[PDB]
Amino acid sequence: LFPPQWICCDIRYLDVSILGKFAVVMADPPWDILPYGTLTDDEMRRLNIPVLQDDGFLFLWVTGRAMELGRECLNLWGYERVDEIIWVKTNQLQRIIHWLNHGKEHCLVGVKGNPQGFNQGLDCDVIVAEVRSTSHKPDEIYGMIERLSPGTRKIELFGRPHNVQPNWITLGNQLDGIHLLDPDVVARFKQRYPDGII
């Protein structure tokens, strides 16, 4: 079902098997590096990412010491890191916003299996875009991911309301309930959760 779908929940406790397989996973985790609900490093290592894909791509936002930890989770979950996108943070005049001031944010790109029929090479590993709210990723990532893998099933982890997109199923704890339209998903959800509760 092409239009947006989402599930308010805690990815720690949700049974992600009901969700099926996806061509692209994206996550922007709340690394313990706390102004919001943080996850520990073991909690991040234990996330059941491996069931989510058989052949596809993982897009994993990182920062600070998560740059290394995120590489660990990526490998633990069974992916190879094959690219790394950086988003250059500009203002409206297209000028750039520990030891150095950080003009950029990193997003690791992992691959798993033998994904085929993708359009590798269309975009380049730099995003230039204006900062919206704090902690918001740039919308360009979705256009990049759609050109890479058009029309396919995609899941986002640790999303918020604005993150909901067509072809995407968003998982987040600050979301407005459960909104599912794919029949195969709606089925396995009712089977696993008859009274809607995790």
Place this chain on the structure above:
Amino acid sequence: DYCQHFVDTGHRPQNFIRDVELIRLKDELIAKSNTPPMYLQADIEAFDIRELTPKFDVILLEPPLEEYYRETKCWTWDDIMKLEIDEIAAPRSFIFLWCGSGEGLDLGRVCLRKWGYRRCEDICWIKTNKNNPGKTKTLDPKAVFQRTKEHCLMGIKGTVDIDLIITEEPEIGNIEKPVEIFHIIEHFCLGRRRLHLFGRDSTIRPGWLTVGPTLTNSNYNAETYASYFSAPNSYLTGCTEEIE
């Protein structure tokens, strides 16, 4: 959406960044404090690194990656990992390691840990293609996107600038890294013993000891080099006046 614009016209999004307090004293102070440039031809694979004394405050390491010769001796990360960097680093010191944009972003982190550093900064050289929008990039097999940048990783061991360098992409088979990396390092004021491994004649520079295989001349002398840091000069940051 400059990403769609790149998919339309071939201009990398970084082409459109504009513009890419007088810290002039710092720079002058750096330049007053710089040791004379020293340099040594040395075939590093076959060269025992320990001969390089004293222990260095900063190490800049620029090994020739195969990927640097897209259309053109390359060092593998296998080779690089075996360099005995920890033996010539000072107990408190910094490393700046150019990692390319491929497996080096991972293997370079293994090296940093192997030699005893923790990464505190990831500096990106973003290459604009303003003078050749119509030149497509022959990608690495594992690549998912066109790769338009290179990473320089900053390591620390022991107790003004952004983390971005934007310049135009060098002509094919020019492997030079932006001189700006040197400004970013010197402005940190991390001390005066500064070694650049795999530099070339073109990278020699006041305040720096350069070692590489392609250097055409040497002037290096350990006792002479050490004299520049004997007391009362041993602990200078490189950002203060000369002791009278």
